[PDB]
Every structure is written in C-alpha cells, then in structure tokens.
Design a protein around this motif. Structure first.
Motif, PDB file in Angstrom:
ATOM      1  N   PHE A 184      68.961  52.189  32.519  1.00 33.17           N
ATOM      2  CA  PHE A 184      67.583  52.254  32.004  1.00 33.17           C
ATOM      3  C   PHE A 184      67.640  52.491  30.491  1.00 33.17           C
ATOM      4  N   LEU A 185      68.592  53.350  30.061  1.00 37.46           N
ATOM      5  CA  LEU A 185      68.921  53.623  28.624  1.00 37.46           C
ATOM      6  C   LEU A 185      70.227  52.961  28.304  1.00 37.46           C
ATOM      7  N   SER A 186      70.343  52.416  27.086  1.00 35.45           N
ATOM      8  CA  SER A 186      71.621  51.945  26.607  1.00 35.45           C
ATOM      9  C   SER A 186      72.515  53.164  26.286  1.00 35.45           C
ATOM     10  N   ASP A 187      73.833  52.940  26.247  1.00 34.06           N
ATOM     11  CA  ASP A 187      74.776  53.994  25.808  1.00 34.06           C
ATOM     12  C   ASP A 187      74.415  54.510  24.402  1.00 34.06           C
ATOM     13  N   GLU A 188      73.993  53.573  23.536  1.00 33.41           N
ATOM     14  CA  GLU A 188      73.629  53.892  22.151  1.00 33.41           C
ATOM     15  C   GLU A 188      72.425  54.837  22.120  1.00 33.41           C
ATOM     16  N   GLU A 189      71.440  54.568  22.991  1.00 35.25           N
ATOM     17  CA  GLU A 189      70.240  55.424  23.115  1.00 35.25           C
ATOM     18  C   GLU A 189      70.571  56.831  23.632  1.00 35.25           C
ATOM     19  N   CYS A 190      71.414  56.924  24.664  1.00 36.40           N
ATOM     20  CA  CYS A 190      71.863  58.242  25.169  1.00 36.40           C
ATOM     21  C   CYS A 190      72.542  59.092  24.098  1.00 36.40           C
ATOM     22  N   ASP A 191      73.490  58.495  23.371  1.00 39.23           N
ATOM     23  CA  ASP A 191      74.233  59.156  22.290  1.00 39.23           C
ATOM     24  C   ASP A 191      73.293  59.592  21.181  1.00 39.23           C
ATOM     25  N   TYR A 192      72.315  58.748  20.845  1.00 44.25           N
ATOM     26  CA  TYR A 192      71.285  59.105  19.839  1.00 44.25           C
ATOM     27  C   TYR A 192      70.547  60.375  20.258  1.00 44.25           C
ATOM     28  N   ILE A 193      70.033  60.386  21.479  1.00 40.37           N
ATOM     29  CA  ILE A 193      69.216  61.496  21.949  1.00 40.37           C
ATOM     30  C   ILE A 193      69.989  62.798  21.951  1.00 40.37           C
ATOM     31  N   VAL A 194      71.245  62.748  22.405  1.00 41.29           N
ATOM     32  CA  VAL A 194      72.137  63.938  22.365  1.00 41.29           C
ATOM     33  C   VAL A 194      72.267  64.464  20.932  1.00 41.29           C
ATOM     34  N   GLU A 195      72.590  63.568  19.976  1.00 42.73           N
ATOM     35  CA  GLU A 195      72.860  63.998  18.613  1.00 42.73           C
ATOM     36  C   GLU A 195      71.599  64.469  17.895  1.00 42.73           C
ATOM     37  N   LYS A 196      70.478  63.818  18.161  1.00 42.43           N
ATOM     38  CA  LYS A 196      69.163  64.229  17.609  1.00 42.43           C
ATOM     39  C   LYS A 196      68.737  65.613  18.165  1.00 42.43           C
ATOM     40  N   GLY A 222      55.954  60.651  21.015  1.00 43.91           N
ATOM     41  CA  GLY A 222      55.824  59.884  19.769  1.00 43.91           C
ATOM     42  C   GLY A 222      56.419  60.509  18.510  1.00 43.91           C
ATOM     43  N   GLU A 223      57.097  61.645  18.643  1.00 43.58           N
ATOM     44  CA  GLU A 223      57.652  62.349  17.479  1.00 43.58           C
ATOM     45  C   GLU A 223      58.792  61.560  16.796  1.00 43.58           C
ATOM     46  N   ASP A 224      59.576  60.831  17.588  1.00 41.77           N
ATOM     47  CA  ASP A 224      60.817  60.266  17.100  1.00 41.77           C
ATOM     48  C   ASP A 224      60.793  58.769  17.353  1.00 41.77           C
ATOM     49  N   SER A 225      61.236  57.964  16.387  1.00 44.60           N
ATOM     50  CA  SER A 225      61.080  56.491  16.508  1.00 44.60           C
ATOM     51  C   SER A 225      61.880  55.830  17.644  1.00 44.60           C
ATOM     52  N   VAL A 226      63.157  56.207  17.780  1.00 42.34           N
ATOM     53  CA  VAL A 226      64.050  55.717  18.838  1.00 42.34           C
ATOM     54  C   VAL A 226      63.539  56.177  20.213  1.00 42.34           C
ATOM     55  N   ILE A 227      63.243  57.467  20.339  1.00 40.77           N
ATOM     56  CA  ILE A 227      62.631  57.987  21.588  1.00 40.77           C
ATOM     57  C   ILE A 227      61.317  57.294  21.956  1.00 40.77           C
ATOM     58  N   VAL A 284      54.468  61.751  38.340  1.00 42.92           N
ATOM     59  CA  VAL A 284      55.795  61.107  38.359  1.00 42.92           C
ATOM     60  C   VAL A 284      56.704  61.845  37.407  1.00 42.92           C
ATOM     61  N   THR A 285      57.934  62.041  37.853  1.00 43.99           N
ATOM     62  CA  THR A 285      59.015  62.534  37.058  1.00 43.99           C
ATOM     63  C   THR A 285      60.032  61.441  36.827  1.00 43.99           C
ATOM     64  N   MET A 286      60.493  61.346  35.572  1.00 42.80           N
ATOM     65  CA  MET A 286      61.593  60.460  35.200  1.00 42.80           C
ATOM     66  C   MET A 286      62.691  61.305  34.635  1.00 42.80           C
ATOM     67  N   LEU A 287      63.872  61.226  35.230  1.00 41.66           N
ATOM     68  CA  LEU A 287      64.975  62.044  34.781  1.00 41.66           C
ATOM     69  C   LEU A 287      66.072  61.081  34.317  1.00 41.66           C
ATOM     70  N   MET A 288      66.484  61.179  33.052  1.00 43.36           N
ATOM     71  CA  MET A 288      67.461  60.259  32.473  1.00 43.36           C
ATOM     72  C   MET A 288      68.780  60.977  32.209  1.00 43.36           C
ATOM     73  N   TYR A 289      69.905  60.403  32.681  1.00 40.36           N
ATOM     74  CA  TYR A 289      71.214  60.996  32.458  1.00 40.36           C
ATOM     75  C   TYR A 289      71.780  60.514  31.160  1.00 40.36           C
ATOM     76  N   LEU A 290      72.092  61.446  30.268  1.00 40.80           N
ATOM     77  CA  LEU A 290      72.602  61.068  28.932  1.00 40.80           C
ATOM     78  C   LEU A 290      74.128  60.990  28.850  1.00 40.80           C
ATOM     79  N   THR A 291      74.774  61.494  29.898  1.00 35.96           N
ATOM     80  CA  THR A 291      76.217  61.528  29.999  1.00 35.96           C
ATOM     81  C   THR A 291      76.565  61.249  31.441  1.00 35.96           C
ATOM     82  N   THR A 292      77.783  60.732  31.634  1.00 37.84           N
ATOM     83  CA  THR A 292      78.373  60.624  32.974  1.00 37.84           C
ATOM     84  C   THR A 292      79.135  61.923  33.311  1.00 37.84           C
ATOM     85  N   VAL A 293      78.900  62.443  34.516  1.00 33.98           N
ATOM     86  CA  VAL A 293      79.559  63.651  34.989  1.00 33.98           C
ATOM     87  C   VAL A 293      80.515  63.271  36.146  1.00 33.98           C
ATOM     88  N   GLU A 294      81.821  63.465  35.942  1.00 33.01           N
ATOM     89  CA  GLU A 294      82.903  63.011  36.880  1.00 33.01           C
ATOM     90  C   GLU A 294      82.843  63.684  38.272  1.00 33.01           C
TER      91      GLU A 294
END
Ligand SMILES: [Cl-]
Length: 182
Positions: free
Chosen positions: A27-39, A56-61, A96-106
C-alpha cells in the motif's frame, strides 16, 4: 484536506467478516515507509514511543492520506491525522482503522485481534499472535478494518493490540476515519 484529492493498484486479501478486514499489499512504497520513520524520528516521545501528524501537515504524508480516502471511499473531511508508533464536531464514531507497517518484523510483533472469529495456527506465528486473527508486519503492507457493523452498531471483534517483537524492530502508522466530517 477535502474529498479525494493517478490511483494505487495492489493486491487485496480478504481476512475476515468479524471484524470486516482486508490486507492491502504494498500500500506504501519502501521509500514512503522510510520517509515517515525519518520524519517522525526526532518528534518521538514516550514501552512504545510515538508522535502525531495533523491531517495535511506534511506533503509526502498528504499524498498517502489521499490514497487512504480513495481505497476506503470515505472523503478526507472524515479522517483524523496520522499516529506513528515505535515499539520497544469530532466526526461522530470512528468507523475504519488503517494500520500501515513501516518496517518488516522477522519474528513476533504481529497485530492481533483476539475477539476475531478466526485464530491463526501453526508455522511462523508467535504465541501471542495465536490468540486471535493476526497479521505479520511487512514493510509497505496495510491492514484495513471496520469497527462498526453496517447498521452503525459496535463491532467488538475490532479490538486490536501489538504482540511483543522477538526478532526485528516495529514501526507503524495508524489512520482513523469517522462516519462524518470532522
Ligand atoms: Cl499493531
């Protein structure tokens, strides 16, 4: 941030009718996940740490927030902002709840829904996860589920929590959306 804002296209897996739930693959690209973590990283405050982004606070989000409106078919006026977690007048009811995983957990770290009608079994599910319906955190995946029945009554099957991480590092972003404009 109103209405719906080139659309997203990925795999949908139906998971349950109780709670009504779908997994959205990539649903999110890897690039989008990494952005959100670092932001989020320098904002994180104290278990888990967290922070909140206004809608609406952040352009990428904000691009991602539009994507959520489109997949859920609920206009942006009804949406909250975005809660980011790292594990170690109001719009009426949430629907509705949407939960997005920003990292893979082994190993471990699953979202678990202990009152779901299904329980996971066997290989690759932690002991905590086996208590209910569970989802493995894979970077980019999103878990979408309804907290109300069609008639607007409560669905108690939508209760959720995070299983302890055994191998890996869990970051997640959660979007809640209401039945009416906020
Ligand atoms: Cl979770």
């Amino acid at each position: 941030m109103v209405g719906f804002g080139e659309e997203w296209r990925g795999e949908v897996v139906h998971l349950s009718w109780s709670p009504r739930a779908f997994l959205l693959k990539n649903f999110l690209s890897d690039e989008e996940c990494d952005y959100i973590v670092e932001k989020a990283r320098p904002k994180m405050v104290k278990t888990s740490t967290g922070t909140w982004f206004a809608k609406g606070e952040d352009s990428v989000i904000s691009k991602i927030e539009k994507r959520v409106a489109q997949v859920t078919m609920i206009p942006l006026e009804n949406h909250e902002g975005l809660q980011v977690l790292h594990y170690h007048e109001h719009g009426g009811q949430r629907v509705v709840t949407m939960l997005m995983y920003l990292t893979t957990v082994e190993e471990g770290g699953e979202t678990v829904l202990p009152n779901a009608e299904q329980k996971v079994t066997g290989d690759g599910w932690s002991e905590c996860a086996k208590r209910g319906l569970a989802v493995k955190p894979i970077k980019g995946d999103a878990l979408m589920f309804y907290s109300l029945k069609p008639d607007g009554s409560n669905d108690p099957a939508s209760l959720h929590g995070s299983c302890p991480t055994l191998k890996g590092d869990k970051w997640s972003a959660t979007k809640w959306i209401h039945v009416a404009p906020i």
